[PDB]
Each structure stands twice: as C-alpha cells, then as structure tokens.
Symmetry: D2
Subunit: 242 residues, 4 copies
C-alpha cells in the first residue's frame, strides 16, 4: 500500500473537528484514506462529528477532548490506543480588544504543547509522524482584530519551528497552516460595506473556503511533504498582515 | 483529484535535478509538460526523459536572460501546444549581480506568460530558489525571491493567478553529491531530519501548488529544508 | 541578616529626572545598561534575585556616581513584583523606563514571556499616568540545542514586543527589543581557540560584541529621539543572523 | 559619541527626511555634503547648512549615473576628504522602481567603499521609501532589507557597518496634502496615533552613524510608530 498522497492505514486525530475548518480537515484526511478521530469539547459536538464521518463514509469516531486538561488528553489518547491504534497524524485546530492577545496565545500554545507531547511517544515508536497546527482565522475587522491575529500567528510560527527542530531526528514533521480570511463563523459577522472593504485588501478578491485550508493540511500529512518541516504555510489569498 | 489534466506546464531548467523532477511530477499529475534547457542536446534529452516516463510534451531551448529567446519560445509554444498556464522557473545561473540577474529573468519570463494566463483568468507561477551548498549568496537570493514573489502575487491576484516560491534546503543533486565530506557533514548537522532532501520532495510541493487545492495560497514561499533555516 | 534594599553636569545627561528600572543588573549586559542609563542622567534602580547581587549593584552605581539603588526582585513572582514596585513608588518615584533583562525549549520561552508580561503590566499604570514610557526587552545572548532555543526565544520576543507595542502606543509608551548576538562576557572568553575562531568566522565583523554596545542601543531607545520607534526588535549581532 | 572629524555624504538632502538627516549629522559634528539632482537643490542645501552653522557643501549628484557618481566622489576627495558616513536617501512598475533603486545603492556604495576600506571604518545607512501602494512599499522594503544584509556581510571584516531605516508614515511635503479621510484611516492603524516627524528618522540615522552602534550591522530599523506592513 505504497502510494504517494494516500493515508491508507494511518490514524489521524483532528481536534476541533465539529464545524468549519476542523470539519473540512477531518473529511479531507478521511477522503485520503485515513481513519479519522475528530474531537470537540462537548458530547453533542462529538456526536455531530461521528454523524458527519458516517454520512461521508469515513471510518473513525467523535470523541470529547479538552486540550487544556492533562487528564483529558491522557485519557483520550489511551482510549484511542486501545480501540483504533496510535495516531500518527495529529492536527491541532482547537483554540474584541487589543489587550486579549496575551492570554489567548499563551493558552493555545500550552495546549499545543500538552497535546503534541502526549502523541510524540507513539510517533517516536513508529519512527514517523505528522503534526500540523492550524492558526486562528482573522477574527475581527479593525485594529484590535489585527493585533490578536498577528500575535497568535507569531507564536504559532515560532512554536512550530522549535518543536520541528526538537523532533525531526525521529522523522516526525511539524508544520503550521496560517489562514487568512476564510468563509466560516468569523466571516458571517459581515456588514456588506465592511465586507467589500475587506475583499479589497485580498488580492484574490474573495474569501477562502474551509476546503482550501483542508487541502493544504492533506498535502502536509502526505509522504510527499516529508522534507517540509518547521514551515508555516500561509493560506490567505495574498493578504499578509503581521 | 489533484489533477492537471488539460493543462500545459512550462518548466525551465528541466534537464537535470530538481527541474527534471518537477517536469516528471507535473507530468505524473496529467499536465502536458514543456521542459527547457539552454542547449539543443539538453532539449533533446528532456524529450527523451518525458517519453521514457510516458509524459506528453516537449523539450525546447530557452535562454531566460534574453528577451528575444523568451518571445520566440513562447510563440512556438502557442502555435504547436497551446498557452502555458503553469510555469515553473527553475533556471538561474558578485552576490549582487547573481540575484539581480535572476530576478530580471524571473520578471522577464513571468511578464511574457501573464498575457495567456490573464486571457484564461487562471494561472500558476512557481519560482524555485537556489539549493544550499556561500551563505551570503544563499540568503540574498532567498530574500529577493521571497520579496519578488510576494509583490508579483499582489500585482496579478485579481486575475486568479497565484504566484508562489519553493525554497530548497540541502537537496541531493548532481551539484551536491560531490561536495567535500567535511562540508556535507557540517550541513547534515544543521538539518533536524538528519538527511538530505530528494529532488522528488521539492517536486511534490510544486505539484501541490500547481493544483486547484492550492488556489488560496499565493505570495507564499514554502521552505523545503528538513528544518534547517538559513 | 542580609539586606535587600541598598540606595558637575555631563552633556550626555538627557534622561534627567527619569527613573529607570533595570532587571538583572548585577553583571554583564544588565550592568552595562544600568551604567549607560546612569550616564544619560537617569536615576537607576538595578535588580537582582539575591541580596548580595542587590548590594553589588549599589556599590557599582556609587563607584560610577550614578544615583539610584540595588533591589531584590523576582520577576517570576506576582508578590515580589507588586512589593518591589510599591517600594520604588514610595521612595524614588514612578519608573518610566523599564528594561527587562532578567522540554526546555518551550518552558524557557513560555516562562520568560510571562515574566515580561507580569512586569510590563505592573509598570504600565505609572506610565499611563505620565503619558510617557519606554519598555525595552533584552533577548538572550546566543548560547542544535543553542540555535533552536535561540530562534524560538527570539520569535517569541519579537511577536510579544510587537503586540504589546500595539496595545500601549496610544499612551505614548514605546515597547522595543534588543536581540544580542555573540557578546563578550566571562563565558565566551574562556573558549578553546579553535572553536572561538570558528565562531568569529560566522560573524562578519569578525569579533564579539561588548556589553557596552548593547547598552548604547538600549540608551538610544530610551531617549526622546527614538519616540517613533516602537514594536521593533533591533539586532545587535555584528551581522550574524541565525533563523 | 560624536562625529567630530568625519565627512558625511547625504544624498537627497534638499527637503524632508534628507534635510533633517543632514542637519542632525551636522549637529553631531560631522562635515556634511548634501546632494540633489539640480543646481537649485544644491544651492538650497548649502544655504540651509550655513544657516545652521554646519560645515560642508551642496553638490549635484545623480545616483543613477556611473559618470555622475565617479565625478562627484573625485570632487569630494580633492576638496573635503573621504566620506566615511554615507546616507542613501535619494531614490525614485514595482519591479523597475526597486530594481533601479538597488542598482543605485550598489553603484554608490561600491564607489565609497574604497575610502572606508582605507580608513578601516565606515557607516552606510540606507533610507527606505516613506509609505505612499502597499505592494510597492513592501517590495521596496524586502529588497532594501536583503540588500542591506548582504552588503553588511561583504564589508564587515573592514569595520564598516551597513544598516537601513524603514520609515512608516512620516510628516513630509508628500504626506501633508493627503485627504483627511485617508489620513484618519492611517492614524487608526498606527499605535502611536500620530505621524512621525522627519527629525525622528534623523535621530535614528544619527545613532547608527555613532561609535555606539558599532555592533549593529545588517539591520533594518523600522521607524513607523508601531505600524507594520
Ligand atoms: C504568550 N506568547 C508566546 N508564548 C510562547 O510560548 N511562545 C513560544 C514558545 C516557544 C517557542 C516559540 C514561541 Cl513564540 N508567544 C507569543 C508570541 C506573541 C505574543 C505572545 C506570545
Ligand atoms: C539585486 N537584488 C534585488 N533586486 C530586486 O529587484 N529585488 C526585488 C525585485 C522586485 C521585488 C522585490 C525585490 Cl526585493 N533584491 C535583492 C535583495 C537582496 C540582495 C539583492 C537583491
């Protein structure tokens, strides 16, 4: 089963998989042959994920996972090990004024670290892995919205790069995807005058689709992206704010 | 489903190494591939490689430093095969003159192929950086490529043409295979993956960027360096 | 029992009447920064985590005719920060110039940024009241292990500095960082000649920086002339850039 | 410290940022040669320098021309001495602008390196374009940063530093006449909530020219009140 874009035989964990980008990522990795475990912080979210996966003929499961909790992480990983196997593809997607940036970024990076560490033992044993971190979508127009956005992206890029360096010798790659303005929950806070002003800052002149983030994640998870590590790939239709 | 069926790709510097690998990968994804070299023997060899791997296309002689060569070659392609909507600049070549010259070559060729991409309201331009194997030339060439790529992407985005770059680290190629062992070992010590990349691993990235799924990626430079950043 | 609080017109003196707080001021770069701000006319409070450090600071300041004090401060502690700042307010005034110079890859960076944030937030009330301030963050000096940690710490410092600058700018408080390369201290002088020469070959200037050369940059950033510089990280590395 | 005993060359010195840089280096004790592309500009520069008690001169220089550069440098060498502080502020779609400017920086920088090499000391400082669209601005900045960094690496062994200053929205002739809608929109994107003054660029240039900035090389210092594009 030696084929290039295919994830047949691999177990992927996708946190925050119940809507938007997380959902699109879960279906895309499913489409590529992975067994997909999607998580949410509630039972209704976990149920919704399972429904979505069956409806699209993807083998896997919805679980409840709280990335902020050492216990939740340990317990969830164990459950996955007993019933489905070791997740070797892990996609972290779980995660207004200009003074909110610090706690938000700080909290997220502690969660990335917590989860990443837990899954490394299995990736280390298999001498293979993919960790892919999804940045926050640009999430409020104006200046407070830019601050939080640039801050979260700076931290994600630096974190991703450092972790990639730590774990590379084990043939585990660690990358990030940095979305711009995507068509999702944030995008549907949307007066048309401010919308058009927004599309004028994006060279492609449109919002990205959640699928378009999911495609990038899918490539990074593949064997072909094995020499890509420590990278943050921007998926923002040419609109760069930092 | 990641497919380039019906598309004509132009890949400069396609007779060896990374250029070759890119030509085959785009061929593998269904594109009709036109690979170039600066000599006729190179152009012929490219044709032979494409057939040997069951890829439709052609080898042409192209000099990216020459306005005449560029114009003539593009016209040739338009008459016989169609408009190239995927273009991969891999041909390149004192730090100042090297970078300055390369970017003029990127600009020259990019400008020429934009008319056809503009007409089709679709395109992919992908610029391949120089491989590592001195540090000054490398960082300079990368800084220019990144900035160039980002600016061009902004200029042409309204037309649904994306422009991206791929920045290789230490890749296994004809130029690197016989570097002295001291320099090779020093470079492996700076690479977390602890190995050299293959030309195919660059080609896979280029292939994804040429696909429909990378339509919201533009102005990016994707480093492909096994975690070694310089 | 050890004590934790130890308290002709030069043309350089442009920070006249300003109180500067310099954490980690007992040796090296922190010391050099304390003297340089002293030389520019500021009243300087240098800190260390021990009483002997705090005493050494006071002795250095007096020996160079700089008014100020050595205090004991633990930037990791909310209590220490609150207490120290109160003490400074009662006895010397509001510090309007603040220079932060005080699995490992993650905890180091994470811890430091929480310390920066803790201290920065505490001093902002006084800067806000005065409608003027300078916060300057000193990165770690360079030193597989030592490049990863270095680039990580620098990426965090840059992003942190830039965000904080955006948050506080409306109040005419600037927030900048200085990112040292290979600086000449006790530890780099005592390297074997072969490794030292290999290091100097990676630095275009072909030498190690002096602590004073970091201090000069910090001094300019603290001045009125750097009032439109904010959110910047100034590299001071003799041309040697590690990403 | 000061620049007593040093000859500084400042291209584009007749108005705005270039003028402010000329006066600031003058104030710090340098002998200042300011250039412009016209004779009236050159005259104006001389008048400004005398009015502020700065020793020096106004010359006509075209940085795009090998002949103009060679001739001007020779003239400076005969009459005033070797310029060891050089500030490139003269500049000028996106591709040709940036390409042209960097060739100008390279042309001029190369010409002044012989004298800096002979003295074993030098300062080259490149001033970026003031914001005024975002594409041209980011492109020009990316090139300036990369150029500055490469040149710094080439010449560092000689104790010559090479740095750049990247202005954000500065108060100048070109920005005074901007409509008060675009103005207010720009102030809202600048944390300091104001435009920079030309003097504030000049102060940074002055520090970089000093002995205290001797370990700073290859840097681009942004002077944009916190507004980063
Ligand atoms: C809290 N925080 C952090 N936290 C953090 O742990 N960063 C970090 C840790 C390891 C490696 C790189 C980074 Cl950036 N980074 C920030 C960047 C910008 C603003 C806030 C940040
Ligand atoms: C010659 N050159 C150039 N030239 C140049 O035109 N760069 C450029 C062109 C178009 C858009 C952006 C850039 Cl940076 N950029 C350099 C960056 C580093 C070193 C040399 C460079």
């Amino acid at each position: 089963y030696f084929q290039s874009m295919s994830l047949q035989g691999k177990v992927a964990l996708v946190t925050g998989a119940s809507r938007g980008i997380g959902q699109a990522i879960a279906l895309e990795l499913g489409r590529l042959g992975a067994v997909v475990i999607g998580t949410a912080t509630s039972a209704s979210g976990a149920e919704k994920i399972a429904e979505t996966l069956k409806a699209n003929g993807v083998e896997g499961a919805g679980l409840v996972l709280d990335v902020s909790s050492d216990e939740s992480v340990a317990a969830t990983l164990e459950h996955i090990q007993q019933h489905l196997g070791q997740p070797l593809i892990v996609v972290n997607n779980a995660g207004m004024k200009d003074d909110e940036w610090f706690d938000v970024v700080n909290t997220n990076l502690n969660s990335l670290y917590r989860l990443s560490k837990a899954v490394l033992r299995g990736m280390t044993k298999a001498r293979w892995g993919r960790i892919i971190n999804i940045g926050s979508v640009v999430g409020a127009m104006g200046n407070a919205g830019q601050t939080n956005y640039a801050a979260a992206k700076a931290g994600l890029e630096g974190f991703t790069r450092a972790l990639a360096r730590e774990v590379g010798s084990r043939a585990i790659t660690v990358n990030a995807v940095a979305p711009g303005f995507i068509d999702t929950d944030m995008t549907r806070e949307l007066p048309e005058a401010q919308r058009e002003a927004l599309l004028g800052q994006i060279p492609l002149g449109r919002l990205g689709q959640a699928e378009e983030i999911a495609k990038v994640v899918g490539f990074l998870a593949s064997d072909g992206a094995a020499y890509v590590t420590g990278a943050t790939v921007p998926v923002n239709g040419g609109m760069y704010m930092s």
